[PDB]
Symmetry: C2
Amino acid sequence: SYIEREIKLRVISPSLEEIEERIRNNYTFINEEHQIDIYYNNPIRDFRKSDEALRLRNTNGKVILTYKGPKQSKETKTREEIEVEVSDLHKMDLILRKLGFIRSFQVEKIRKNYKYADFIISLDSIKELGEFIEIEGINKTEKELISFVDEFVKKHQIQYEKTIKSYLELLVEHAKK
Amino acid sequence: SYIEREIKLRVISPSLEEIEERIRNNYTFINEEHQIDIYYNNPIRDFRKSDEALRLRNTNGKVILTYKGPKQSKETKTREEIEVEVSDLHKMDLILRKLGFIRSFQVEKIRKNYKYADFIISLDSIKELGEFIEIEGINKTEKELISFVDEFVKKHQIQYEKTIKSYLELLVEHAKK
Ligand SMILES: [K+]
Ligand SMILES: [K+]
């Protein structure tokens, strides 16, 4: 198991395209990912009450099953994460459903990944939710991440609102407004 | 989903090595597989009561997650089977355990696979259980399989006892004798 530590920002200003223009010359483009995620629940453990997640992700055709444990921080999005690649999305979904998991909600996004000195900056355009940025740390501290996010938003004059809610939780908040 | 239909024979006579000698010249060797299987239970659904199975198999280093539904026949071993290859056995096991599945029993065998006209004949040497043969049908009927198994055992003068119990169930019967 590994510990994912990331900070998610709802972008208010400017546009992500404008933000890419601003970072393009000092941040190294990695790739663009079209990610379609299916989330699952289990009738025994409410993954809403225990703060867990189960996801079957299709990212540019690669299929990834991920477990996410409860949040460990209130200042960043910090969770245990265990992932495996699987050979077939339909069959993995079928297995989960045969085992009694139920399909909950689906998240879809386009994500543009950049790299700047052990930090991954992901520009996310979320279907129905809007434009966000995530920053994840490789071999980093909560304090080192909070300081980089702060230098990042200010160097590129971004107006943002930080959150530790997941995209799944955010989507549900959005559906009923 | 696909329907697995196979017949398992406890070999009484002769030795599997003697049986391979007898089939070697008319059956085409496919491969040998060293298979280590972990089975799982779920505290909600007793996979013993519902007749289901969940397996994480390591076969010659390839990792396969398989769901098996209830038996559909009393004359052959017939079950729904859904399988995916996964990238990492330890992480898949960790995910299953984080989700609440519990490791039940482990089956280990050496399996020698041969092919003779749409039939797969698997010579199985099962740790602690002994020598068995499975015959699985590709695009076949219960009747076509029952007839081939019968021609197989007689052409090669095998003394056998057919069973539709799984190797998991058989192992448990063996442990308490
Ligand atoms: K994420
Ligand atoms: K089998």
